[PDB]
Structure 1
Amino acid sequence: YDIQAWKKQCEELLNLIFQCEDSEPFRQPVDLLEYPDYRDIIDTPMDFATVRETLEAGNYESPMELCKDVRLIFSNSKAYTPSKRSRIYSMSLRLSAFFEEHISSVLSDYKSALRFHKR
């Protein structure tokens, strides 16, 4: 029922994501010279370095907020891809599956801890 435990659990999961070769395209913001039309398609860029820095700054209140930003990385890739058979989109789908498999317990434990706190 530790309502702070999610933060280190998220740090550790980001560390695992950074070790995954599938995270390579998502570790830093998209560059607007290599993909010059990116901001015509994507309103809110997001990447894993920005997620880690937001966490480490103490600017997430909950793991749900972190989860929303990570899911934005993946929805941006799906929106920008020219094909469902894209290399970088295909990497995003594997990485999303990995993320979702690991974040589920972090969310459940946090929400349970908070329900206990407010019992």
Structure 2
Amino acid sequence: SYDIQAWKKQCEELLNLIFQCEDSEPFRQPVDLLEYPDYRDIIDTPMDFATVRETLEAGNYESPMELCKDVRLIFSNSKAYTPSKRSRIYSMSLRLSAFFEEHISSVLSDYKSALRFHKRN
């Protein structure tokens, strides 16, 4: 399965699944400062799933590793901003992260395998 470009549609489909998950609700759009005026004192690099989808659709990811780094930043931002490990929105982040990691593993493996095959000779 050595298609170097296949990751992009596989990532589009995974983002559609994440948007169908009720657990993605807090993460579908950039955090609103009006609600959380201290957010940028704690979070240097806001990230959300709509920004990830737009970056992919613009052709501004070169690899699924770059997309994975931005999705992981959504989850690390949540873990940093939560006052409790027993918070609703944080607990939503942890279930969504497990779902994402379970599905991205094959996308990353197939891509890196395809690139190694491209450089075989």
On whether the aligned pair clears a TM of 0.5, the verdict is yes
Distance in 2, matches of 1:35 and 1:21, equals 22
Q: Distance in 2 between matches of 1:82 and 1:44?
A: 19
- Give deviations 1:27-51, integer Å, cap 9, x for gaps: 0000000011000000000000000
1:104 alignment counterpart: 105
Task: State the secondary structure of the residue aligned to 2:36.
Answer: coil
What is the root-mean-square deviation in Å for CA atoms of aligned residues?
Answer: 0.2
Runs of 4+ residues deviating >3 angstroms: none
Query: What's the CA shift string for 1:74-107, capped at 9, x where partnerless?
Result: 0000000000000000000000000000000000
Deviations 1:20-71 (A, max 9, x none): 0000000000000001100000000000000000000000000000000000
Identity across matched positions, percent: 100
Shift of 1:113: 0.2
TM-score after normalising by structure 1: 1.00
Task: Provide the C-alpha distance between the structure 2 equivalents of 1:104 and 1:60, rounded to a whole number of angstroms.
Answer: 17
Total equivalences in the alignment: 119
With normalisation by structure 2, the TM-score equals 0.98
- Gapped regions of structure 1 (runs ≥ 5): none
Match of 2:86 in 1: 85
Counterparts of 1:80 and 1:60 in 2: how far apart (Å)?
A: 27
CA distance in structure 1 between the partners assigned to 2:114 and 2:84 by the alignment:
42
